[PDB]
Write a protein that binds this ligand. Structure first.
Ligand SMILES: CCCCCCCCCCCCCCCCCC(=O)OC[C@H](CO[C@@H]1O[C@H](CO[C@H]2O[C@H](CO)[C@H](O)[C@H](O)[C@H]2O)[C@H](O)[C@H](O)[C@H]1O)OC(=O)CCCCCCCCCCCCCCCCC
Ligand code: CLA
Ligand code: CLA
Ligand code: CLA
Ligand code: CLA
Ligand SMILES: C=Cc1c(C)c2cc3nc(c4c5[nH]c(cc6nc(cc1[nH]2)C(C)=C6CC)c(C)c5C(=O)[C@@H]4C(=O)OC)[C@@H](CCC(=O)OC/C=C(\C)CCC[C@H](C)CCC[C@H](C)CCCC(C)C)[C@@H]3C
Ligand SMILES: CCCCCCCCCCCCCCCC(=O)OC[C@H](CO[C@@H]1O[C@H](CS(=O)(=O)O)[C@@H](O)[C@H](O)[C@H]1O)OC(=O)CCCCCCCCCCCCCCC
Ligand SMILES: CCCCCCCCCCCCCCCC(=O)OC[C@H](COP(=O)(O)OC[C@@H](O)CO)OC(=O)CCCCCCCCCCCCCCC
Ligand SMILES: CC1=C(/C=C/C(C)=C/C=C/C(C)=C/C=C/C=C(C)/C=C/C=C(C)/C=C/C2=C(C)CCCC2(C)C)C(C)(C)CCC1
Ligand SMILES: CC1=C(/C=C/C(C)=C/C=C/C(C)=C/C=C/C=C(C)/C=C/C=C(C)/C=C/C2=C(C)CCCC2(C)C)C(C)(C)CCC1
Ligand SMILES: CCCCCCCCCCCCCCCCCC(=O)O
Ligand SMILES: CCCCCCCCCCCCCCCCCC(=O)O
Ligand code: OEX
Ligand SMILES: [Cl-]
Ligand SMILES: [Cl-]
Ligand SMILES: [Fe+2]
Lengths: 55, 65, 82, 56, 36, 38, 341, 33, 34, 34, 505, 30, 37, 32, 30
């Protein structure tokens, strides 16, 4: 918690697997990411005016 | 202890406490029926599971007509 | 104290031990290696190769949607790459 | 409020994919394991000092 | 019996692990699973 | 009549019997050779 | 002096790895559960059941590999190798998710095996069977979560998949769909697991800091002998410390160690119960009185309403890719989103 | 708030019955001594 | 005089043999390219 | 197919090599079993 | 003193007071059944078995009396909706009454057996000590069980001397109590075949008679007597608990998946019927069949019995409830009054659109309208600003066929949206929310509540099996291990065989 | 009524703390 | 007829009273919110 | 019947509290 | 709920009669 305080975050394997053409091949990490997205977009739903939640 | 009419009549049915047949007795026969009962439960489970499918056995509500 | 098996620290500091295992350990390593480098692992287990998750102009998952035809469904999808 | 903090933490930091939270889970799972183990091993080897009508 | 000394067996095994796991982290950045 | 899945059932059932009997044959064998001295 | 007794003689010989009668069940099943997991995570895809890569062979790492659940369309099929789905074909068996049932079911009989082994060894060595009793909590968790829960749902597909990140997805699924953090059976489980770790640390720390000086070395570990009669640390001084520090202390070594069994075992049993409820979607999802107020009063807001907005986001943003058999198509305009994000 | 009216009595009995059971047993333990 | 082939011998090799083989397969994998 | 013997050859050669280095003392052990 | 968790161990060597306590337990349980029934009779509304059946009213024992042939009240009503019946003495009320009189009688016997605990029947004639010959007792009780099991199947279920049991058609429309002929062939293991239930009880009834007779006459082998501690009554409690949690898992399962003994008119539909659109398929099958024969849309849907339509509604899905959402289903969505009719959505180009149905996992679900091929053509947008598919833009209308709103069409967008919001639940009903002050949130049916209880009790009883089994096999060290257990018996090597002192090296 | 109930229970727990600490069975040695 | 030989005293020490009251009060505190709902 | 909702708790406690007082007094009388 | 309450209290009284009569303190001559 103390080091995620300075935004050194958990491993990101979002789109780490792609196929011979370049298609993304989802893994369980990308499914985690869909859940993380739904938390992100909803939290403090009136509080963000700009596109990145930088803190 | 108190004797009662009904007690005197049932007495023989609670009078062989501790009596055993020697050695292994019927254990091999018990084992056989255990084995048959397991396969029997296997079949029943797998029919319900639709892992075992049988002619004329439609495991659905539509087996009421 | 002991159940009469030969102690491990006696075995792995022993010369006979390493005489056998300097062969058996690399050979196994190379066997597993060849299992993959030959492509055999792919075919045994059915794992897609990087070029065979999708067909060229496809972006649908070839998802099994039937229980008892499921084996047939997979085979259908696999033909749609050949 | 606690749960709100931990859901938002996951969205902003992916804490579950962070190895220090994984060690924390191993610290807490393992602690509960070894708590039970130790309690059960000691309880298992209590020396008979009592009758079956009294708490050991 | 006790010829090959234990400290040496430990060091060589040890480096053999470091090498295998090294290769596994190298492959996180190369080839399949590298995002590239 | 004997459907394909009833066939697999017996296949599954014979395989289990084999694995189980094979297992116990070996265990009885070894136990007979390597007895405890009393 | 017949064959059964001779085999008994041999199964119960004192050797490096004890076997026992329970070993016949345990060791095959444990080794196969464990080999199935290692095999699947190294070589087997989840492409046809989940639309997911899930093996080292496909490019996954230790955190993202998994043996994933069968497709939803399999229902609760046992998925035997010789069954009507795979029809004896090993390759298709792997591709349909047969390794999941393989691991789950061999795993369950191995867990039985293991607890029978704790019973068997306890009886031979002459001790009371409490370690076996305690292990009932791990079994309750395993069966309720990996078996009872998907059996109340539509299919094995919604069971946990055997994998690190896959289990993380299961955590988040339960938040968004079941509001499981609100469930008091989870809360009692949390208290038992966190209470266990506390008790583990505080008991170790106490013993180590009320040691009797029994040797002359700065390393105090040497000054113990497992056959000494005497207690190796002062219960009297430990009791005084905690009484003065915390108000109350243990005074009975037996109660102490029983309570260390009791606390985490009971917590795990409680969490198993709540998962049995969730098998039926019998969730502690809402507080009715809160919803009635909030529906009528748009200035009313609690951490409880804020968390359901997050749940609603989780459901809509993850369901299409997490439940592919459902063909969810959510146009952009229907996704719940706050401002800007 | 529109709460389940029976929540009160459920909670009162939930507390009272098992507590009273323990108090009864404690007091008669003390009078043995 | 110690025996060579024991129940211990089997437990050990029952795990070590596939492990080394699996480590070999996984090392090859680091050189697969898409 | 052919890939199966390629994979399997190092496994046989490995076990063949161990069989020949150990055989003398494996014989002895077996004899001691009564 | 005894710890509190051990007070009832004073009965272990006291067969009479053990019988007394089993009698009191049986009294309390009989007493509960009668009390519960009388409460349900006092709360049950029998006036509409179509839209307010028992299983919407939180009825729990009413379905169990009905299942075995009790269907009428002394008040003149029956659960099938027949009126002016004369059930005889074996009405719901008379069943309740009997259980209360039984409970009274069991209470008095319990007092007699408590007081006159010291009966010579319970003493062993040789030693004079309390002793129960548990192996013979098993044979006796098993022989009894088999007689009862046989008679239940041969007379009650067949209707030979009895009412039969609840049977219905596949869609739960026409249920009633009927005699059932045994199914002796392999379909008698089909859980959905009622004849199998008959055959089971006859066949297993004979096997228990034969097995009981064996267990009366044949003594247990010495090996098994010792192994299983057959002079110890706690070994019976251990095995009995195992059989009971086995039994509880089976009845939870068949309650959840459904079988011939858990019909949907007594317990409600199953979640799988929602999962597989079971009732929707039958309804569509019927409407098509009406249309092929030249009926109009209005006529094809008006022929759909309201009872079938009400099954095709998620609020009757037992997997839509919550743990602390208490009471009957009616307390939530209300008392159903009328099918409103089948809603048909179309867009401005006249294409039929289909509301995507809510799945049971989702507390909330968006409103998405698809064409026959699954292409999104309308929704209710969240963010309005870049919406492409609003009802307002696509000109979505709703038209009703059958039911209350038959022949009515609606075009104002907020009304059209209101119906599409209900259409995700399936078929649309008018509900009375005022009478019970319904809060609008889905509750589970007695099918749900029964499964939850029995699955939970089965799991708990597993620990009970483990506990009492441990206690039976380890009775000799319950109070602690031997204070003269020497370190040679736990240290490695000394004994070739673990714990066996005859194998010292 | 529910506020009163919640606070009442919490208050009983605090009173119990006081008796548990200052009116415990005193631990006595040997 | 003799009086019953199997009767035993029962005990609850003061520490068990405290522990049990605490258990009940905390359980009430946890579940009461779900009973009011 | 639109009766008083607190009537139940008032009756319930009215019986319970004094009955429990008496039962406590009586049991600890017998155990001495 | 009030019907149940009235009947409950009445039922408790009938049980008390039973115990009051059949489990009285036996009167004895000292
Ligand atoms: C603690 C000790 C631990 C020791 C445990 C050791 C490991 C034990 C091994 C256990 C194996 C159990 C797997 C059973 C699979 C199962 O259930 O499989 C499920 C099948 C039912 O199959 C399902 O049935 C559903 C309902 O179908 C029905 O309804 C549909 C809707 O209309 C259609 O009409 C359809 O035709 C009709 O069959 C759907 O079809 C599902 O897709 C299909 O899987 O039942 C059946 O096999 C059998 C059902 C009755 C037996 C119940 C046994 C108890 C197991 C469940 C206990 C948990 C209770 C769950 C509730 C919580
Ligand atoms: C104690 C060891 C043990 C146990 C408990 C299990 C248990 C199981 N295994 Mg595993 N398995 C084991 C060892 C074990 N296995 C071993 C050693 C191997 C390697 C060979 C495997 C390989 C394996 C595979 C490959 C698969 C399983 C599967 C299964 C499941 C189905 C078993 C079944 O239906 O059997 C049916 C058979 C029996 C229950 C045996 C009953 C035999 C009775 C006693 C006698 C009946 C009479 C007999 C047939 C007479 C012969 C007649 C003949 C002359 C014609 C079950 C969870 C399947 C699975 O996991 O599905 C997902 C699966 O696909 N197992
Ligand atoms: C403060 C944080 C916290 C804490 C302490 C807990 C504590 C707990 N959670 Mg909860 N959880 C939390 C937050 C937390 N949770 C949050 C925020 C969420 C999101 C909603 C969840 C979601 C969640 C879910 C979804 C589930 C839990 C479960 C559990 C329990 C897990 C029991 C256990 O150890 O299972 C570990 C597994 C076992 C004990 C089973 C058997 C294990 C066998 C013995 C393995 C043997 C391994 C074998 C030797 C091979 C190993 C080799 C291999 C590793 C290589 C426990 C009560 C589970 C639960 O309630 O289950 C009943 C569950 O399903 N949690
Ligand atoms: C197997 C048991 C069983 C089942 C399945 C049912 C089922 C049902 N009953 Mg019935 N009932 C039963 C037993 C049962 N009943 C008994 C024994 C009684 C006498 C008390 C009644 C009295 C009764 C009445 C008076 C009413 C019902 C009603 C109902 C319906 C709604 C139930 C509801 O809201 O649940 C709500 C359930 C809960 C909120 C779950 C409680 C969870 C407990 C409190 C958790 C405890 C945890 C524990 C303290 C932790 C300790 C562990 C550890 C730390 C040591 C439903 C069909 C209602 C109805 O609709 O009837 C027409 C109704 O009004 N029942
Ligand atoms: C047929 C079922 C059955 C029977 C007859 C017994 C009988 C017994 N048990 Mg076992 N037991 C069972 C099931 C059973 N148990 C199950 C399912 C479990 C797991 C929960 C246990 C766990 C268990 C443990 C862990 C212990 C016993 C002990 C005992 C003995 C003393 C019990 C006592 O004095 O309680 C006295 C209990 C009380 C005064 C209060 C208990 C009230 C509880 C907390 C909650 C309320 C229960 C509720 C009112 C009604 C039941 C609801 C529902 C089941 C119908 C006694 C021989 C004890 C023993 O071994 O002594 C040597 C012991 O330590 N039992
Ligand atoms: C994740 C948490 C967790 C793990 C990993 C774990 C692990 C273990 N606990 C054991 C014991 C215990 N656990 C106990 C209390 C607890 N255990 C807990 C939590 C856990 N316990 C908790 C919280 C408690 C407190 C109540 C006790 C009291 C004991 C023991 O006595 C026992 C022990 O000896 O500890 C030293 C061991 C049993 C060995 C065994 O059965 O071998 C045989 C192996 C078998 C049968 C294989 C099972 C396979 C499983 C069920 C399915 C497949 C799993 C895959 C292979 C791996 C999946 C990995 C992905 C999901 C990421 C094992 C080390
Ligand atoms: C398709 C089906 C697949 C599954 C089929 C089932 C196969 C199951 C096989 C399991 C048998 C494993 C037992 C191995 C025993 C061993 O090899 O050594 C046996 C012993 C020999 O050495 C001896 O070792 C002994 C030590 S001990 O017994 O190993 O402990 C020692 O006592 C003795 O003096 C010494 O000579
Ligand atoms: C600076 C001051 C420090 C602040 C002091 C605060 C007091 C907190 C301590 C608890 C007092 C009550 C102990 C109860 C009962 C008590 O008196 O038991 C005392 C008991 C004494 O054990 P012995 O070993 O003496 O007993 C052995 C035999 O008597 C067995 O019968 O100790 C334990 O069992 C401790 C383990 C339970 C410890 C439980 C602590 C949990 C506290 C958390 C509760 C929080 C809920 C709050 C929600 C609102
Ligand atoms: C499934 C199946 C089966 C079985 C199989 C098996 C049983 C297998 C096994 C397998 C195996 C058995 C595997 C193994 C593997 C292993 C591995 C893969 C390992 C690895 C490891 C590692 C990597 C580690 C490392 C490290 C680190 C990282 C850090 C710490 C330290 C160390 C060094 C340890 C059969 C045939 C019956 C048939 C059916 C199917
Ligand atoms: C004496 C007599 C009489 C009378 C009788 C009576 C009047 C009866 C009553 C009885 C009754 C009327 C009974 C009832 C009872 C009930 C019960 C027994 C209940 C129980 C309960 C419980 C057990 C519960 C639990 C729970 C809860 C509370 C919560 C939730 C969960 C549970 C479920 C766990 C007569 C006239 C016949 C004649 C002569 C003699
Ligand atoms: C321990 C050995 C660590 C090796 C890490 C390799 C880092 C990979 C960076 C790269 O080669 O692109
Ligand atoms: C109780 C122990 C049970 C042991 C189970 C081991 C089963 C052994 C695996 C045998 C699998 C062979 C199936 C492949 C052939 C099936 C062909 C077919 O379906 O007709
Ligand atoms: O505040 Mn609480 O939460 Ca950390 O990011 Mn930015 O900010 Mn707010 O949003 Mn996401
Ligand atoms: Cl928020
Ligand atoms: Cl901003
Ligand atoms: Fe300790």
């Amino acid at each position: 918690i103390s080091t995620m305080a300075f935004n050194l975050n958990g491993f990101n394997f979002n789109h780490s697997v792609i196929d011979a053409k370049g298609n993304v091949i989802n893994t369980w990490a990308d499914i985690i990411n869909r859940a993380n997205l739904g938390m992100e977009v909803m939290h403090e739903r009136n509080a963000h005016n700009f596109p990145l939640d930088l803190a | 202890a108190r004797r009662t009419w009904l007690g005197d009549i049932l007495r023989p049915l609670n009078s062989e406490y501790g009596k055993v047949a020697p050695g292994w007795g019927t254990t091999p026969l018990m084992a056989v029926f255990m084995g048959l009962f397991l396969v029997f439960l296997l079949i029943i489970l797998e029919i319900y599971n639709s892992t075992l499918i049988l002619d004329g056995v439609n495991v659905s509500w539509k087996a009421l007509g | 104290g002991t159940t009469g098996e030969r102690p491990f620290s006696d075995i792995i500091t022993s010369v006979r031990y390493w005489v056998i295992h300097s062969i058996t350990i690399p050979a196994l390593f190379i066997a597993g290696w060849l299992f993959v480098s030959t492509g055999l692992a792919y075919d045994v287990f059915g794992t897609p190769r990087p070029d065979s998750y999708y067909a060229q102009e496809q972006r649908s998952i070839p998802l099994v949607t039937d229980r008892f035809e499921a084996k047939q469904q997979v085979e259908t999808f696999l033909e749609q790459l050949k | 409020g606690t749960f709100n903090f931990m859901i938002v933490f996951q969205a902003e930091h992916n804490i579950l994919m962070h190895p220090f939270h994984q060690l924390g889970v191993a610290g807490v799972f393992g602690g509960a394991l070894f708590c039970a183990m130790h309690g059960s091993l000691v309880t298992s080897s209590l020396i008979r000092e009592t009758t079956e009508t009294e708490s050991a | 019996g006790g010829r090959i000394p234990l400290w040496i067996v430990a060091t060589v095994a040890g480096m053999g692990v470091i090498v295998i796991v090294g290769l596994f982290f190298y492959g996180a950045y190369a080839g399949l699973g590298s995002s590239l | 009549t004997i459907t394909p899945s009833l066939k697999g059932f017996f296949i599954g059932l014979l395989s289990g019997a084999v694995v189980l009997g094979l297992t116990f044959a070996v265990l009885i064998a070894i136990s007979q050779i390597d007895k405890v001295q009393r | 002096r017949g064959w059964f007794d001779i085999l008994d003689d041999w199964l119960k010989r004192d050797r490096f790895v004890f076997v026992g009668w329970s070993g016949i069940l345990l060791f095959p099943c444990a080794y196969l559960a464990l080999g199935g997991w290692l095999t699947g995570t190294t070589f087997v895809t989840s492409w046809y059941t989940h639309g997911l890569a899930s093996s080292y062979l496909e490019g996954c790492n230790f955190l993202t590999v998994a043996v994933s659940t069968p497709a939803n369309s399999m229902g609760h099929s046992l998925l035997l190798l010789w069954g009507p789905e795979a029809q004896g074909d090993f390759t298709r068996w792997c591709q349909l998710g047969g390794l999941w049932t393989f691991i789950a079911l061999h795993g369950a009989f191995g867990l039985i095996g293991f607890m029978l082994r704790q019973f068997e060894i306890a009886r031979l060595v002459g001790v009371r069977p409490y370690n076996a009793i305690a292990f009932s909590a791990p079994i309750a968790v395993f069966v309720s979560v990996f078996l009872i829960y998907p059996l109340g749902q539509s299919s094995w597909f919604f069971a946990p998949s055997f994998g690190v990140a896959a289990i993380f997805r299961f955590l988040l699924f339960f938040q968004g769909f079941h509001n499981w953090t609100l469930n008091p059976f989870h809360m009692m489980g949390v208290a038992g697991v966190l209470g266990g770790a506390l008790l583990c640390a505080i008991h170790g720390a106490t013993v180590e800091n009320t040691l009797f000086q029994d040797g002359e070395g700065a390393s105090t570990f040497r000054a113990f002998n497992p056959t000494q009669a005497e207690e190796t640390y002062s219960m009297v001084t430990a009791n005084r410390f905690w009484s003065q520090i915390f108000g109350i202390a243990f005074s009975n070594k037996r109660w102490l160690h029983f309570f260390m069994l009791f606390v985490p075992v009971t917590g795990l049993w409680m969490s198993a119960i709540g998962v049995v409820g969730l098998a039926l979607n019998l969730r502690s999802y809402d507080f009715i009185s809160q919803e009635i107020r909030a529906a009528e009063d748009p200035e009313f807001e609690t951490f409880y309403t804020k968390n359901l907005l997050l749940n609603e986001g989780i459901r809509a943003w993850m369901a299409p890719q997490d439940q592919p058999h459902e063909n969810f198509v959510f146009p952009e305009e229907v996704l719940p989103r706050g401002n800007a994000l | 708030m529109e709460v389940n009216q029976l929540g009160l009595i459920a909670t009162a009995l939930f507390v009272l019955v098992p507590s009273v059971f323990l108090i009864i047993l404690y007091v008669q333990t003390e009078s043995q001594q | 005089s110690y025996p060579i082939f024991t129940v211990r011998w089997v437990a050990v090799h029952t795990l070590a043999v596939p492990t080394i083989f699996f480590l070999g397969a996984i090392a090859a994998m680091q050189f697969i390219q898409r | 197919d052919w890939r199966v013997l390629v994979v399997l050859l190092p496994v046989l050669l490995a076990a063949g090599w161990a069989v020949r280095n150990i055989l003398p003392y494996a014989v002895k052990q077996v004899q001691k079993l009564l | 003193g005894l710890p509190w968790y051990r007070v009832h161990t004073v009965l272990i060597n006291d067969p009479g007071r053990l019988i007394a306590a089993h009698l009191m337990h049986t009294a309390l349980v009989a007493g509960w059944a009668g009390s519960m029934a009388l409460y349900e009779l006092a709360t049950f509304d029998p006036s509409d078995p179509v839209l307010n059946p028992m299983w919407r009213q939180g009825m729990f024992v009413l379905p169990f009396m009905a299942r075995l042939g009790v269907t009428g009240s002394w008040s003149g009503w029956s659960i099938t909706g027949e009126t002016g019946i004369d059930p005889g003495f074996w009405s719901f009320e008379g069943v309740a009454l009997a259980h209360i009189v039984l409970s009274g009688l069991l209470f008095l016997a319990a007092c007699w057996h408590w007081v006159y605990w010291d009966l010579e029947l319970f003493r062993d004639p040789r030693t004079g000590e309390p002793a129960l010959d548990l192996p013979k007792m098993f044979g006796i009780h098993l022989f009894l069980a088999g007689l009862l099991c046989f008679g239940f199947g041969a007379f009650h279920l067949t209707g030979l001397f009895g009412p039969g049991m609840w049977v219905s058609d596949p869609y739960g429309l026409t249920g009633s109590v009927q005699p059932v002929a045994p199914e002796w062939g392999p379909d008698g293991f089909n859980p959905y075949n009622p004849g199998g239930v008959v055959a089971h009880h006859i066949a297993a009834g004979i096997v228990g008679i034969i097995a009981g007779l064996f267990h009366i006459l044949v003594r247990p082998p010495q090996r098994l007597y010792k192994a299983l501690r057959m002079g110890n009554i706690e070994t019976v409690l251990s095995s009995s608990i195992a059989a009971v949690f086995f039994a509880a898992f089976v009845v939870a399962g068949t309650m959840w998946y459904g079988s011939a003994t858990t019909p949907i008119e007594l317990f409600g539909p199953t979640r799988y019927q929602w999962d597989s659109s079971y009732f929707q398929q039958e309804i569509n099958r019927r409407v098509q069949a009406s249309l092929a024969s030249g009926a109009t849309l209005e006529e094809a849907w008006s022929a759909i019995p309201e009872k079938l339509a009400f099954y095709d509604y998620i609020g009757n899905n037992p997997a839509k409830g919550g743990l602390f959402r208490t009471g009957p289903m009616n307390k939530g969505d209300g008392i159903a009054q009328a099918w409103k009719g089948h809603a048909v959505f179309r867009n401005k180009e006249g294409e039929e659109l289909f509301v995507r149905r809510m799945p049971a996992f989702f507390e909330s679900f968006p409103v998405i309208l698809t064409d026959k091929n699954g292409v999104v053509k309308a929704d209710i947008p969240f963010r309005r600003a870049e919406s492409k598919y609003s009802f307002e833009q696509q000109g979505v209308t709703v038209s009703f066929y059958g039911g209350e709103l038959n022949g009515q069409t609606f075009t104002d967008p907020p009304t059209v949206k209101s119906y599409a919001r209900k259409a995700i639940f399936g078929e649309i009903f008018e509900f009375d929310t005022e009478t019970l002050n319904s809060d609008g949130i889905f509750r589970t049916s007695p099918r749900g509540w029964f499964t939850f209880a029995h699955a939970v009790f089965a799991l708990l009883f597993f620990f009970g099996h483990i506990w009492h089994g441990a206690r039976t096999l380890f009775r000799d060290v319950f109070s602690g291990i031997d204070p003269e257990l020497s370190p040679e018996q736990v240290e490695w090597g000394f004994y070739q065989k673990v714990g066996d002192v005859t194998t010292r090296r | 009524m529910e506020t009163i109930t919640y606070v009442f229970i919490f208050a009983c727990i605090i009173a119990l703390f006081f008796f548990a600490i200052f009116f415990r069975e005193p631990p006595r040695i040997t | 007829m003799e009086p019953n030989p199997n009767r035993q005293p029962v005990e609850l020490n003061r520490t068990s009273l405290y522990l049990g009251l605490l258990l009940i009060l905390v359980l009430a505190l946890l579940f009461s919110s779900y009973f009011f709902n």
